[PDB]
Design a protein around this ligand. Structure first.
Ligand SMILES: *[C@@H]1O[C@H](CO)[C@@H](O)[C@H](O)[C@H]1NC(C)=O
Lengths: 176, 440, 126, 167, 123, 431, 126, 439
């Protein structure tokens, strides 16, 4: 009967602080390790850390020194804080729970929905349309609609590109 | 044949009731019934009674009794609500031995005075496990649970030393004692003896090693609810005791800080001499012999060829993965990974490092804690290890290796090793029987 | 002198001679946690004694330990006769055999006692 | 340490698929990850199985390798499988990830188009489920399009290497 | 069968055949301090009636006979009219007074009976 | 003739005793046994004189409801640090926006935080300087947001040696002999409800609309009316409220009001006109029996001064409404399809429930929109006389004392003790 | 009328008709910190009266104030005359010189009643 | 001769129980059982009982009941936590204050109010005995700001003692000794049996007894051991001696709010003149009562023994000085002129003796550490009259014997009324033999 849901899917820039709050509905906060996990296409599934109701945390050694988990028992919440986020932390963040006791055979239960968090890496630019089909070179906010289509490309500079084969281009923020 | 009515027949049925206690402190033995020394135990000769130590209500009644008896001794004690302030903590580097490095923090903070319009700047030595940084030469700190609850300091005039208590039975009820020396917890007993009240149960709190308490008679006994299932704990009872020796080598000082009218907070002053970590000792040969006897007894259930292994704990919190007790009023946490590390193919000492907390959260209640006051001088401790709580890791229906790790967590399994030979019944004195006799 | 509940292993022929040691041992034979619950235990013990004494008093066997009634014993309740019941069985084994049929006996005894009391009053009328 | 998994396992419908792990010293439990859904456990020990999981999932472990076998897979078992293991220093150590693909469609030949600058390489209409483009190279992961096919793109400021048939 | 108070409107000749079902429903039950005080009050109220039955010598039986004669000043009615044309409520409403003198006469009669019985057994 | 002592006779006398109570709420599962299939032994040929205006169970119900109201407030936060100097800004002029200093978990630091209070909860201490209305009388304790004030029934069982008699007369007016007395083990499910001028969620009369009073000639007594058909009522609180948690100190939180999403509109809830008309017709038809066939019955809105007496105060969904009922008590009656009547309501957060001096409650806000659905099952009238021969009678709603809401449910019940000892002459003597 | 406990100064002969005026007051004589005190006092009084009634009912004297028993007097607990016990002695010094040998009587009465009940059971079987 | 069992014999034994109060303020007599007027008092003719009052248990139960009712009545009262502030007091010299009146300081301090972000500066008049230094004007504080926090008693609750009766429960009895000359230990003839005691008033006093029962026919003196020097020697008077203590200062009570729904009643300005509270005792009546005491002292201690009286030796203020309360003010009358008499053995009206009576506001009642009671001031002029019905002596030690008044140990004050009562447990079971046998 215990269900978990986190905050809405936000988006952050580089060198900032990430913040997600999970809310438990039903059940108590005692005798349960409230964990945090993330899932990325580059590295697969990964564990971040858990907090017990007395405040005893246990972070992952890879992310130690830039992670912080706090518990708020009275309002039935627990939060995750990530410090100095880079462009390689674009992942779907889950929340789970573990029974108190031995962790040799323990598996994560009561998973969350999963809120996608992306990192912009400080990029904002208007469209650039080149003729060939048609090719769009650089645009940040994904507003494009090609009318007279291959999906976008995660370039290393933080900008997106697609192309279409067989025109009019659209850009909602720049009004292009 | 006619119906004949008899009153007072020896017929009992299983039932439950509220058992009152007796005694020969937190446990508050001044208000209990005194115990009269009398030949209270007699023998029932040709009877067999079904026992079950895993479905006994007395281990669920006595847990609630200890919980309700524990928190009423905190009501005439000071609550540390004004202490949740900002702490300016500093590392101590006064004759450390490179093991207790960074464990103690020298924190100075503002505190109220008995006069309401004055303030004082005091200082204390807090452990690392009781302080949490907030600004993620001096850094700002705070207590570990002032975001959760402000909790009562334990008064210095009461003691946490356990004393034996007896559990009597009310009128119309009886307590039957299991006198079989080869009892395994569940099953019928061919030697059942009634008794007026139980023996002395000492309410010693522990998590991995059953300190003090009663021993076995013939040999080491293994008790479980279901030995095939790996999700249920295994209680081991020894026949000979293994002696442990506590130590806190630091010479602490306690100073009183007045935080209000008639209320005092006991802080930690400076430490005379060097700072050394706490440790516990155990003999190597006696522990090796006891582990050999436990391995010999464990091969009766899991095959007579399997390689019994041991490994250290795998818990998450500090009360499960680390052996915890109290001695002299200070709560210890023993690493105990040097004991359970061996494999068994078919005057040296082991030193176990320790850690000490002060913000104590007993009985796993939400939003309640305790501040343990410091103890002046060194602290000594002699105890008997008369039991273990093991947990098995099983991922094969047929296997040649088994790994046993120490358990813990739930406090209820400590008193199930003392109330396994007792049960409560209700006497029903009415009965009818046919006999060739009739009224007028 | 076996003591309290010390004749439970013996046969019911010889365990019926020691009804006094179990009849006498009933009836006792918040500021503090030990205050309210021991009072509730005492009240429960008094009520459990008084219910049994009332049940003995309705049937007409008040003040005596062994009482003889005039209700005939049905063969449907049991088939064993006097020889092995009182010399081979105990009270615990006998309690598990007539446990289903005790309410019928408890009704028949009070009906017979009410009939006997009304007959006694009718005989005293003349 | 780190557990090792095969990157891709491809089986026909009705057949069986075996996923193996390695380098594990204690009990291994498996997870099933579908796109857009929360992960769920299917085998929570070396051999056990929770309620609500069908009989088609079973597993075993011998020595230091744990194997997970799917008995008669359908199209609803197209997911990504991860296994974890417990370690003393880092508490949970997960696996690399094995993707199970069922083949409801026959093979297809990709179409490659190239454009001169006024560089793009566009690859479409293929079903092995995987294309590794070899020529500042950015490669698009294979995503779906209409009539149940896949598409890919490449950019340089091209050779498809389409298994044994390179265009 | 009538119930707990199913003979409350019936005659005294018919309500006297069902005295068991009101007698056995007087301790615990078709009937923290709030429970305990009520239970102690019920036990005490049963014990007072049992003691008053025991002093008169009527202990252990629901219907008893005594040797105290019936004064005509208490009631002057017929035997086939009291037991056939009256209920227990109107009878208790009739003799609400003159009850303490009846209780004292019963106690004196039982004390004289026990003295005479001891005198006869002394021989 | 000789005296024969009988035991266990069915003789009862009236008495007063402590009754039982069987059934996160008003009452509690902590203080209740279970109540299986009950007994309704129908006592034949019995006539007992009931009286509902001097019953003991109504006072016991009032005491138990008050005492178990107080028992859910002890493990809750007391809002004593919140009595500060508010700096408030601005239907219109009803919802204010106050900001104030407030302490934090750490005693050294302090925070500035804002919240929305109503106009009925703040008072000016001499403009732009307000304080709460309770802070010169008593500090309020908050209601913890797990316990709910939703009505569920409770049953009053009887202890041993006592009996509860239920009158089964269809046309029983409250006092007088009842020729259908039947005992019962425990009373039926009585729902405790807070209400004024309109008995909500109550039991209905089975045959006709009944008028009950202690003295219908006297005008100083309340008149209790019971319906046979219910009148429905549906509410709205159309402000999309947001609850935010201001943290007071260690483990103590204060749930305030955030911003209001969308437009701001007042609270109101409706009575169908085609039912309330001819419901008042049945009421006037049954009131003309006690006052003559040629009397002009008329109604007025209110005459009190306090807010709880004047307005229909109840609890819809966790919020305490104070609805101004003047459109319903607006009619005249002379002897010879989807429209509704809207009543403007108000919301108060600082609540003094049982008219006690020095004990109050801050009620937390509720997220979303809150709706009623209820049955109006009764009225509490108060006649204003003046003339011995009056052709026009004015009836006004009343209230005040709380025991009259539970006197419409415990009206058919009476507790008696058993006196099982009797003597009778019989022609038999002891040997 | 001597009232309650007013015959304590009188001899055994005069004090033997006033058992009913004292035996009425062993149970009740009456119509926050005073709640639990009165509760435990009422519980203790009820339990003491029930213990006395059970001790009377064990010996076979239930419902009677004076009863005779078949066990004889050894004339060693008190060897004085019958004429100077019931006419030249009050109850207080009688208790004061009998209190050593009041324990062996209390088991003899019970054993005599048990033997009488067994003999009655054997006699009624014919 | 056969054993005959009797039930209901009049036999009692010594035991202990929990008696309950009954009556027809601090002591909640309205929570007692409402008793009727006493219907009967049974007289026992040939009953001899051995009484003892220094091992009586009803004294301890009465002491526990009085302490418990005091603690229960001070529970829902306001607690003066924020009153422990730094007082800035100035010594008062406004017009005629006598040379014996260099006390009653005038203190001003900052105090909190209803809204917790504002502060108010108020003033109050405190006595010297409740204010100590901490070091134009000096800096002061209250005395118990390092021991506890005081709980101010409400003005609606009075300290006037009304009588309470102790009643034995069912199965017990109370024996009353009706001897005219009874010294407390030994056989008392004419024992009476009651179900409830008489109207005992829980009066609180130190060296005298102020509202009690007079003696029967003579001044009777009683003690546990006459020859022991460390035992209090209780004296009960035959004739009552009237004492008048009054407070001539006209007082005004203010109201200072200290928070949400809390009040602190402080002493305002004095409307009139400042004069000492005095304690008048008549001289000729006291001389006659001292003669009646010393006659029985010469009877007990030696018929040529020289008896000397003196004032108290030393200790706390609550021991050496007669302490009581009229209304709500706690007077402390000196009582040094009362015992200043030599009584040689060879020789064998409107005028009165005044005693200076000091007043404390902060009262430590039962000498318990951590408890306090701030008595609020009472406006007007306090007047009271009472009877000195006894006093507690203490022998200090040849032919010369010096007697000092005692103090403390309120169970000795409650031994002057519970000296004739005794609780017994009835045992109605007899085994007396007759010439009867069962069938
Ligand atoms: C008040 O008393 C002190 C006691 O030392 C004295 O010095 C001072 O002069 C007095 N004050 C006045 C104003 O006389």
């Amino acid at each position: 009967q215990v269900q978990l849901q986190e905050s809405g899917p936000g988006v952050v820039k580089s060198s900032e602080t990430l913040s997600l709050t999970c809310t438990v509905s039903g059940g108590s906060m005692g005798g349960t390790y409230w964990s945090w996990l993330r899932l990325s296409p580059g590295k697969g599934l990964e564990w971040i850390g858990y907090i017990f109701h007395t405040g005893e945390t246990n972070y992952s050694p890879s992310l130690k020194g830039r992670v912080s988990i706090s518990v708020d028992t009275s309002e039935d919440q627990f939060s995750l804080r990530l410090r100095s986020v880079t462009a390689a932390d674009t992942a779907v963040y889950f929340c789970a729970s573990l029974p108190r006791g031995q962790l040799v055979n323990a598996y994560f239960r009561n998973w969350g929905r999963g809120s996608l968090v992306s990192v912009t890496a400080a990029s904002t630019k208007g469209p650039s349309v080149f003729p060939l089909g048609c090719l769009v070179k650089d645009y940040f906010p994904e507003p494009v609609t090609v009318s007279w289509t291959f999906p976008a490309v995660l370039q290393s500079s933080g900008l997106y590109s697609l192309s279409s084969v067989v025109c009019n281009v659209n850009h909602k923020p720049s009004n292009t | 044949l006619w119906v004949t009515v008899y009153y007072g027949v020896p017929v009992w049925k299983d039932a439950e009731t509220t058992l009152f206690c007796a005694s020969d402190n937190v446990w508050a033995t001044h208000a209990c019934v005194p115990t009269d020394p009398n030949p209270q135990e007699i023998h029932l000769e040709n009877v067999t009674e079904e026992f079950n130590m895993w479905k006994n209500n007395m281990v669920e009644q006595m847990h609630t009794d200890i919980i309700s008896l524990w928190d009423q001794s905190l009501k005439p004690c000071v609550k540390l609500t004004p202490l949740c302030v900002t702490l300016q903590c500093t590392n101590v580097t006064n004759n450390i031995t490179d093991d207790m490095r960074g464990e103690l923090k020298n924190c100075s903070f503002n505190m109220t005075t008995e006069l309401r319009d004055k303030k004082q700047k005091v200082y204390s030595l807090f452990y690392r496990l009781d302080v949490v940084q907030i600004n993620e030469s001096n850094k700002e700190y705070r207590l570990i649970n002032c975001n959760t609850s402000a909790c009562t300091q334990a008064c210095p005039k009461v003691s946490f030393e356990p004393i034996p208590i007896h559990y009597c039975a009310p009128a119309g009820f009886a307590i039957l004692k299991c006198k079989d020396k080869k009892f395994n917890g569940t099953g019928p007993c061919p030697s059942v003896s009634t008794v007026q009240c139980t023996h002395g149960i000492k309410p010693v709190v522990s998590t991995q090693l059953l300190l003090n308490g009663s021993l076995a008679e013939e040999e080491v006994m293994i008790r479980s609810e279901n030995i095939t299932n790996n999700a249920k704990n295994i209680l081991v009872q020894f026949n000979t005791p293994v002696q442990i020796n506590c130590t806190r080598p630091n010479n602490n000082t306690r100073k009183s800080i007045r935080i209000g009218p008639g209320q005092a907070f006991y802080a930690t002053g400076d430490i005379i001499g060097d700072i050394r970590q706490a440790h516990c000792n155990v003999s190597k040969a006696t522990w090796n012999e006891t582990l050999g006897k436990v391995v010999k007894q464990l091969r009766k259930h899991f095959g007579n060829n399997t390689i019994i292994r041991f490994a250290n704990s795998s818990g998450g919190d500090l009360e499960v993965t680390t052996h915890s007790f109290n001695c002299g009023g200070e709560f210890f946490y023993c690493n105990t990974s040097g004991l359970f590390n061996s494999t068994w193919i078919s005057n040296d000492s082991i030193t176990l490092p320790c850690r000490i907390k002060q913000i104590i959260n007993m009985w796993q209640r939400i939003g309640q804690c305790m501040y343990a006051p410091p103890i002046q001088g060194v602290i000594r401790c002699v105890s008997n290890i008369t039991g273990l709580i093991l947990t098995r890791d099983g991922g094969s229906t047929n296997s040649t290796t088994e790994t046993f790790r120490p358990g813990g967590g739930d406090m209820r399994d400590n008193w199930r090793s003392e109330l396994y030979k007792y049960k409560v019944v209700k006497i029903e004195p009415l009965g009818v029987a046919p006999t060739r006799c009739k009224r007028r | 002198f076996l003591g309290f509940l010390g004749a439970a292993g013996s046969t019911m022929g010889a365990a019926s001679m020691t009804l006094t040691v179990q009849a006498r041992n009933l009836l006792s034979g918040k500021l503090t946690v030990w205050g309210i619950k021991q009072l509730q235990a005492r009240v429960l013990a008094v009520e459990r004694y008084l219910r049994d004494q009332q049940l003995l008093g309705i049937w007409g066997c008040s003040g005596k330990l062994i009482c003889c009634t005039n209700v005939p014993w049905n063969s449907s309740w049991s088939n064993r006769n006097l020889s092995e019941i009182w010399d081979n069985m105990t009270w615990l084994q006998w309690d598990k055999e007539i446990s289903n049929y005790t309410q019928i006996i408890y009704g028949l005894l009070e009906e017979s006692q009410n009939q006997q009391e009304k007959n006694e009053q009718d005989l005293l009328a003349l | 340490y780190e557990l090792t998994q095969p990157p891709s396992v491809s089986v026909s419908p009705g057949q069986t698929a075996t996923i193996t792990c390695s380098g594990a010293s204690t009990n291994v439990c498996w997870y099933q990850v579908k796109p857009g859904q929360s992960p769920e456990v299917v085998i929570f020990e070396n051999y056990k199985r929770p309620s609500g999981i069908p009989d088609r999932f079973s597993g075993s472990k011998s020595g230091s390798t744990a194997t997970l076998t799917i008995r008669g897979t359908q199209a609803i078992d197209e997911a990504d499988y991860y296994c974890q293991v417990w370690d003393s220093f880092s508490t949970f150590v997960f696996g690399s990830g094995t993707q199970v693909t069922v083949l409801g469609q026959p093979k297809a030949n990709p179409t490659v188009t190239l454009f001169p600058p006024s560089l793009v390489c566009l690859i479409s209409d293929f079903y092995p489920g995987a294309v590794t483009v070899a020529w500042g190279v950015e490669t698009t992961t294979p995503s779906k399009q209409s009539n149940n096919k896949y598409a890919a793109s490449s950019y340089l400021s091209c050779q498809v290497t389409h298994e044994g048939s390179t265009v």
